[PDB]
């Protein structure tokens, strides 16, 4: 319980603009998929292949930091660092890390989201996709501002529809995209359990009707619930 | 923006954002003991200088804290606000709170005071070898005390309350970005692995 | 005083917040790429809706309309809604309250942009009943923490007047458009939520007698989208 | 408002008493023949020294502080009163006094230069005890007779408000040096005496319902005897 | 001589030493960026601290003072470092000696910038009492090193002067700020380090006869944080 | 009638002052009667000693 005090010059505004409070590449989804070789299909959607819808809600950190404000409109630079991992044991020298390439694909709004991954649609060629490997570095895509509204309603007082329940603050806007990553290469005899750690950077900011940040802890992505 | 005024922690959610005033409170009397302190618990915890400049590590500059009376027309009583400086000790009685810097606000006409501090200044240091100890700043008091008896009409409440404010003006300045602590990961969001389907 | 609509507002000085510092207008060259025939700049719409006054105790917590949701239903405004898919209008928030001179409060009249209110230790979304309340409005739980997980202590950063009942009764905040979009539908959607919030409870030597909080807004520059369209040529 | 000193006393408008007309001010020609060493304009001296609020009743009489006896053994004015021989000073009278606007009530904020009080019955002088009373201060036990043998109702003639409660809660009295002496010990001798003598009970149905009366006093163009001297050449 | 103070100390020529050949001054430019409110040009803290004279035998080794480990406790200087939580000042150290023509010795004057001393054969840091020694100040146990492991071959890179008795009794170093910080606190930090060092024990054909070492500092410039500030408007 | 609110005071006090114009004027001064000679004060004989 020291208790110190030192005199700051701090003679700067810049560090504090909004275009460099939030472009800081941070972790915002992260998951390890199960690549390795499924000759039955178990546990489907989600083994073969990384699916993320895009939003900053998922981690907590640079949720509480993006809804400090209503609206923004930011291309986001995804960077997808994936380390693979392999699953066992074969010798103990050296197991054998193949440079296997990795369809980083974005799939946007009005967009089919593959469900495997060996679909049709990591094909398409209307949906971007990027093809790099682990040996490379890791793949800097910056997406563009995917909203059909001029900014992203972290807050939408609102549902998607007149009918349903449960789209309160689900915009039929924002919607960034599906960030789905695959393995194109067809199963190894070994196997890895790749764990795609993307991140996003904010570029362009601009930033609308600035906030209360968030004080008790999230209780879930889609919407605002509090423990009080 | 408020502060947590009242620091006693039995008042806790609504009525910790505004102090009580009671004919009963009487004179020469600590009535709040807001610090000039940002990364400690306080008043100065769910403000806005205080949470955004908890995105910081160092947050040099100047505040302007506001206070509005929030009682009757005509409830008269003089109360005098006792800012006190990094260097010193904090004040007990309003004898040590008129030798400081102090202003004597009567909020029997005037039902919004305005108060200028200048230059604070703290940061966070990690000067321990890998210890993550964490260390905190003093480097200020905003003080409370009553003047005279707080007197109102019979028909009027004689418990009359007190909020407060606080702002930042244009030499206040944040440097050095970091995480803010006051959500942590929790990683069991009921949300979560929703959008990961 | 406010006469500019089909109902007026008798009250002492304005003191007007320009909510963000700006007035609220129809569509400038964002028109041409928005969803056409946005014609009508109707002025009937503006009539100043006198919501009906919720009732300030010391026991009470505080209370929401949301714009889109108060306003819908009832009037031209209402009428407008049912019939027309999507709107633009800015909304001037004016808070009334015939508090005696005698009386003790404070009240935060806050205008929210998006207010993506949370339940209360349930996980789930909060619904249509309990989201689209209406004319009356929905009362806050815990107003301290807004009903979002933000904290009260910081909602004056929003677009905000203030209910100190020993120097005003009055607040007026002329909020803008304050959407994302140019244009968005009023059943999906709340741009803006007036929120009235009590920091300080009414204080009287009694049990906190009466005092009504008479809630008055009126759509200023409404503009919905034009049925009446020349199909032809 | 009174933003020139460390201390800041926000009120309503002002209304000052030019106390004889005239203003402080420090030493002019009367430097060079008076005590030299003079030089220090002490300005953190000028901090508004609000002393502990007076509690004001029907049943009360009057309360005096002489203006040496306050703000002495506090503050800096306190510690350069310890430790400086002799000084000049006028003061700033500020009396405040938290009033509704349903209390009732006059006051005679008088200043008195040389308030040799008098005992009462006792032909022997008031000594240390019962003059050098401090930050508290005494009370008029004869507040008509001004304790000094005078009468209360020729006391306006002195440097003077009037805390008439149904038209103003606040005085201010600038004071000058008041002395024979331009430059005089604090220890021994007081300039002035601020004296808050109600003429009208505090009023109220209740049992004279609390008020508080907060005195602020600030030293203005305070200036003591400079220890700190070039004592070679 | 050196009458700029409020004490003089009479010597014979000056022969300052501009340390690194600046003198001292106040804030600058920096004055803004740094803590604010330090108006206070405080010179009544400018007063010529001699300390108490230390005995310079053949058998002696070395003494030193910190510069705010002297001059705080005692004076307009220490009052300030109690009641002011951060600082600047130059000093300006004059070291005399009544040393007779007949005496023998050299001594060097040598003020260090940031004398983070060791101890002796000990790995644990030195703390507060073998540090913040005071008025008197301490003793060099080893001044060939300077108790920081250092040589004292290599001490006249820092400012200093050189008291060879056949030529000068007097040494006069004028030290600026001497500080990373434009300001800094003088209870937690000292910016520089007076020491005496007889690189030469005093010598006489008796048992080395007695000189005192008289140790005269006056901070100049010395400039401190201002408590009176007008916390107002 | 004199009225005032319940909450507040009934018997509400007056006072009044008196001061004189320019045209007011003395002449052909007096000793005061306010005061007579005592004869018998504690402090006299004591200057007189």
């Known amino acids: 319980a020291i208790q110190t005090r030192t005199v700051i010059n701090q003679h700067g505004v810049s560090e504090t603009l909004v275009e ?16 390795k070789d499924h000759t039955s299909s178990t546990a489907q959607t989600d083994k073969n292949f990384f699916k993320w819808t895009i939003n900053t809600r998922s981690f907590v950190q640079l949720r509480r930091k993006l809804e400090l404000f209503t609206y923004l409109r930011f291309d986001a630079e995804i960077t997808i660092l994936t380390t693979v ?7 103990n020298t050296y197991v054998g890390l193949p440079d296997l390439t990795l369809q980083a694909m974005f799939v946007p709004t009005g967009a089919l989201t593959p469900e495997k991954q060996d679909s049709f649609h990591w094909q398409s060629g209307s949906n971007a996709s990027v093809f790099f490997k682990i040996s490379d570095p890791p793949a800097r895509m910056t997406i563009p501002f995917m909203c059909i509204n001029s900014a992203y309603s972290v807050f939408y007082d609102g549902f998607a529809g007149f009918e349903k329940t449960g789209l309160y603050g689900i915009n039929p806007a924002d919607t960034i995209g599906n960030l789905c990553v695959r393995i194109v290469n067809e199963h190894q005899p070994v196997g890895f359990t790749v764990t795609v750690r993307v991140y996003m950077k904010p570029k362009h900011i ?5 906030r209360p940040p968030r004080t008790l802890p999230y209780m879930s992505i889609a919407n605002a619930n509090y423990k009080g | 923006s408020m502060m947590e005024i009242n620091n006693t922690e039995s008042a806790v959610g609504m009525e910790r954002l505004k102090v009580d005033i009671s004919a009963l409170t009487d004179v020469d009397q600590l009535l709040f003991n807001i610090p000039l302190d940002i990364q400690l618990d306080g008043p100065l915890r769910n403000t806005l200088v205080g949470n955004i400049s908890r995105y910081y590590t160092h947050w040099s500059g ?6 509005m009376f929030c009682g009757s027309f005509m409830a008269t009583g003089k109360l005098i ?20 810097t102090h202003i004597v606000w009567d909020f029997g006409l005037q ?14 240091y990690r000067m321990f070898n890998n210890d993550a100890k964490s260390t905190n700043a003093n480097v200020g008091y905003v003080t409370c005390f009553m003047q005279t008896n707080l007197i109102v009409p019979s028909e009027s409440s004689d418990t009359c309350s007190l909020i407060g404010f606080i702002a930042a003006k244009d030499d206040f300045s944040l440097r050095l970005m970091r995480d803010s602590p006051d959500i942590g990961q929790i990683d069991h969001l009921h949300g979560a692995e929703a959008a990961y389907q | 005083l406010k006469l500019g609509n089909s109902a007026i507002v008798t009250q002492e000085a304005a003191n007007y917040c320009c909510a963000y510092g700006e007035w609220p207008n129809y569509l400038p060259d964002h028109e041409a790429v928005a969803i056409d025939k946005p ?3 109707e002025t009937a719409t503006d009539r100043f809706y006198t919501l009906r006054s919720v009732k300030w105790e010391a026991t009470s917590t505080g209370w929401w309309w949301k714009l889109p949701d108060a306003l819908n239903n009832i009037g031209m405004f209402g009428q407008n809604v049912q019939h027309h898919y999507l709107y633009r209008s800015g909304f001037l928030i004016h808070v009334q309250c015939n508090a005696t001179k005698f009386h003790q409060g404070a009240l935060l009249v806050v205008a929210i942009p998006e207010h993506q209110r949370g339940a209360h230790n349930t996980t789930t979304s909060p619904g249509f009943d309990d989201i689209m309340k209406g004319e009356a409005g929905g009362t806050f739980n815990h107003p301290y923490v807004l009903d979002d997980g933000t904290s009260l202590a910081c909602a004056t950063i929003f677009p905000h007047q203030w209910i100190n009942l020993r120097t005003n009764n009055s607040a007026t905040i002329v909020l803008p458009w304050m959407n994302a979009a140019p244009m968005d539908f009023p059943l999906r959607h709340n741009q803006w939520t007036l929120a009235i919030i009590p920091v300080v409870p009414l204080g009287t030597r009694t049990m906190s007698s009466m005092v009504p ?7 200023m520059c409404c503009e919905f989208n034009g049925l009446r369209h020349a199909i032809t040529q």
Not at chain 1, 206 to 210: E, F, I, L, Q
């Open chain 1, 85 to 91: 991992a392999v699953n066992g044991s074969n010798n």
């Open chain 2, 81 to 100: 606000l006792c800012y006190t400086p990094p260097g010193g000790s904090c004040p007990t009685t309003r004898e040590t709170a008129m030798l400081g």
């Open chain 3, 213 to 219: 909080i008479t809630v008055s807004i009126a759509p």
């Open chain 1, 206 to 210: 601009k930033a609308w009707a600035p």
């Open chain 1, 20 to 35: 460099n409070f939030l472009s800081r590449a941070a972790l915002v989804s992260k998951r390890s998929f199960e690549y």
């Open chain 3, 39 to 41: 014609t009508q700049p």
């Open chain 2, 62 to 67: 100047s505040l302007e804290m506001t206070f």
């Open chain 2, 111 to 124: 039902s919004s005071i305005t108060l200028i501090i200048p230059w604070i200044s703290g940061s966070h």
